Amino acid sequence: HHHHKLIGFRFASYIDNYMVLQKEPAGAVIWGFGIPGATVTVTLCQGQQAIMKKVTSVKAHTNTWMVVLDPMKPGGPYEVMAQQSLWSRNFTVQVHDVLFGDVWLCSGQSNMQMTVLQIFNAVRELSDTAAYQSVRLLSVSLTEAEEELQDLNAVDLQWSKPTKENLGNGDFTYMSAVCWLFGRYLYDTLQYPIGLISSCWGGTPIEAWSSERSLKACGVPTKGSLLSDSVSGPSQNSILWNAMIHPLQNMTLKGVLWYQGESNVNYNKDLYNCTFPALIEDWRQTFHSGSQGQTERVFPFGFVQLSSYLSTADDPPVGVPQIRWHQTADLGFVPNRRMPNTFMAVALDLCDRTSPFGSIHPRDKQTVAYRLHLGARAVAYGEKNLTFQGPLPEKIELLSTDGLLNLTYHQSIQVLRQDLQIFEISCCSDRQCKWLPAPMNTFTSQTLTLSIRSCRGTVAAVRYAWTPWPCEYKQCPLYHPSSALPAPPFLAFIT
């Protein structure tokens, strides 16, 4: 039958068998729909034994109900029951195989959407599901709406233990490789249940994923900007937020994983350094409110920095590095003052020349997940003495007489090769500035000199890796030796 027997009493869409609810010290939120005047009793059971009971009622002209569970220790399985007591009649719904752990929401565009089927060494990564059954998966369906939705419209993959079949179901459909591998490495580390919720659509600018509030705070035009071929998907303000994120606001989370930016290369580019941090803040506010304060007011938000690829032919190439910079709030590293409790994975050395899905869809999502997982371990789980940032210049000295720029990095650096063009200097001379290459010259363990001899004026600024395609696969010029992390792109001014 198309209908169920019981219609008026059901859990909210994010609740189902085999799901994962956020662990201690937060309380799991359980909400759903019911008949007015009913009294709802949620009972958390471990087999035959009821461990926890919460009680609420469905107010007069409302049709929803919600309780907040007590904090729980990670593990399982558990069963969640809800009973609607409506005067003389009782109705119950039950979900089983429920786990408590860390809940991570994965969002972004096509590089998040890209699934385990399409990635490097796909067969092994799809078969090695045995040890990770406590990692649970849910993929949200592509739906768009012009107003915020209370519940999800549709779900492509319901809460499931990972299998070959649902990890790699078609192309750009079931379970991101990035989220899956991030959750897999996070489980390797934490050894307790992880829940991964994939809500992403390829070709989408950040405006689509932001609420009205953050967009207003950044002065995004209400009437959408003209868009290029880089914006292949839903672009209207908040259209994907309304339907694919907002329904989850009342759920208790560990954090968010983000892989977006490619479509903002030529859509409201110069606003990303506002809109992306705003979005983060906004979500933190909203999800904190929606979950009755259970989701941390400043929860971990980890994102991927754009990789090396070729953008579409009607975009100015410069947009790609600019977004990479805007993704850091124009500071080059995270966490920072504008983006606290955030972690980043540098991806510009993880390109793919032979990808059958386009340079923009690199097939090495494992290294991306590994670097994201370092960031998460450090920021989300406060792991100390763990390196998760690439080397960046902490001091820049100008030796004009020698024709040199001396860059002292906060980290030890490893120089693979002497690259002549990856660094650039702004030669300014009486109201005329121009960018020129600064070849790498001589280096020590923690510092590197660039040849500014080509500049006949003053050196105002220096930038590193300001290209759409700055490096070949793991053939960037600069890495931290111990951590094997690439030096991130940067723009610094000389004062």
Ligand X SMILES: *[C@@H]1O[C@H](CO)[C@@H](O[C@@H]2O[C@H](CO)[C@@H](O[C@@H]3O[C@H](CO)[C@@H](O)[C@H](O[C@H]4O[C@H](CO)[C@@H](O)[C@H](O)[C@@H]4O)[C@@H]3O)[C@H](O)[C@H]2NC(C)=O)[C@H](O)[C@H]1NC(C)=O
Ligand Y SMILES: *[C@@H]1O[C@H](CO[C@@H]2O[C@@H](C)[C@@H](O)[C@@H](O)[C@@H]2O)[C@@H](O[C@@H]2O[C@H](CO)[C@@H](O[C@@H]3O[C@H](CO)[C@@H](O)[C@H](O[C@H]4O[C@H](CO)[C@@H](O)[C@H](O)[C@@H]4O)[C@@H]3O)[C@H](O)[C@H]2NC(C)=O)[C@H](O)[C@H]1NC(C)=O
Ligand Z SMILES: *[C@@H]1O[C@H](CO)[C@@H](O[C@@H]2O[C@H](CO)[C@@H](O[C@@H]3O[C@H](CO[C@H]4O[C@H](CO)[C@@H](O)[C@H](O)[C@@H]4O)[C@@H](O)[C@H](O[C@H]4O[C@H](CO)[C@@H](O)[C@H](O)[C@@H]4O)[C@@H]3O)[C@H](O)[C@H]2NC(C)=O)[C@H](O)[C@H]1NC(C)=O
State the Cα–Cα distance between residues 321 and 311, nearest whole angstrom.
11
310 and 319 Cβ atoms separated by less than 8 Å = no
Which residue reads 């490619």 in tokens? 262
Q: How far is the CB of 82 from ligand Y (least distance, A)?
A: 10
Site for ligand X in 55-74 (CB under 6 A): 64, 66
DSSP state, residue 44: E
Of the candidate spans 220-228, 327-335, 380-388, 444-452, the one that interacts with ligand X by CB under 6 A turns out to be 444-452
Residue 41 binds: one of ligand Z, ligand Y, ligand X, none (C-beta under 5 to 8 A by kind): ligand Y
The option from ligand Y, ligand X, ligand Z, none interacting with 273 (CB < 5 to 8 A, set by class) reads ligand Z
Task: Answer with the entry of ligand X, ligand Y, ligand Z, none that 250 interacts with (C-beta below 5 to 8 A by kind).
Answer: ligand X
**Three-state secondary-structure class, residue 306:** coil
The answer to whether 247 and 177 have CB atoms below 8 angstroms apart is no
289 binds ligand X (CB under 6 A): yes
* Subset of residues 296 to 315 that bind ligand X, contact rule: CB under 6 A: none
CB of 10 to ligand Y, least distance (A): 18
Cα Rg of the chain (Å, integer): 25
Pick the piece of the chain touching ligand Z (CB under 6 A) from 103-111, 266-274, 450-458, 477-485.
Answer: 266-274
Nearest position to ligand Z, beta carbon: 273
* Residue 162 DSSP one-character state: -
The string of DSSP letters for 373-406 reads: HHHHHHHTS---S---S---EEEEEEETTTTEEE
Question: Most distant CA pair in the chain: distance in Å?
Answer: 92
Q: Give the x/- contact pattern for ligand Z in 216-255, rule: CB under 6 A.
A: ----------------------------------------
Q: Evaluate the CA torsion angle 387, 389, 391, 397 in order and state its sign.
A: negative
* Beta carbon of residue 332, minimum distance to ligand Z (angstroms, whole number): 12
CB of 93 to ligand Z, least distance (A): 48
> Interior CA angle at 410 toward 418 and 257, to 5°?
95
Choose one: 80-88, 218-226, 232-240, 443-451; the region binding ligand X (CB under 6 A).
Answer: 443-451
Residue 270 binds: one of ligand Z, ligand X, ligand Y, none (C-beta under 5 to 8 A by kind): ligand Z
Alpha helices in 79-176 (DSSP H): 110-113, 122-127, 164-167
| Residue 41 CB, nearest approach to ligand Y (Å) | 5
Residue numbers of the site for ligand Y (CB under 6 A)? 41, 43, 83, 85, 90
Q: Least distance from C-beta 105 to ligand X, angstroms?
A: 16
The single residue listed with the structure tokens 């590193």 is 464
Choice between 51 and 428, CB closer to ligand Z: 428
445 touching ligand X, by CB under 6 A:
no
CB 303 within 8 A of CB 327: yes
Strand 301-304, strand 342-345: pairing: parallel
Q: How far is CA 94 from the centre of its chain?
A: 32
Quote the CA–CA distance of 327 and 309 in Å, as a whole number: 16
Q: State which of residues 97, 156, 171, 330 lies at the interface with ligand Z (CB under 6 A).
A: 330
**Terminal alpha carbon distance of the chain:** 73
Is 325 in contact with 491 (CB distance < 8 Å)?
A: yes
* Residue closer to ligand X (CB basis): 137 or 245: 245
Q: Which of residues 267-306 bind ligand Z (CB under 6 A)?
A: 270, 273-274
Choice between 235 and 273, CB closer to ligand Z: 273
The distance of closest approach from Cβ of residue 274 to ligand Z in the complex, given in angstroms and rounded to an integer, is 5
Distance from CA of residue 292 to its chain's centroid? 23
Residues 244-260 as b or e (16 or more Cβ within 10 Å = b): bbbbbbbbbbbbbbbbb
Q: Examine residue 475 and tell whether it contacts ligand X (CB under 6 A).
A: no
Residues 147-206 within binding reach of ligand Z (CB under 6 A): none
Among 41, 63, 150, 458, binds ligand X (CB under 6 A): 150
Q: Coil, strand or helix: which one is 125?
A: helix
What is the closest distance, in whole angstroms, from the C-beta atom of residue 269 to ligand Z in the complex?
Answer: 8
- The site map against ligand Z for 50-69 (x = CB under 6 A) is --------------------
290 touches ligand X (CB under 6 A)? yes
In eight-state DSSP terms, residue 324 is H
- Interface residues with ligand Z (CB under 6 A) are 270, 273-274, 330
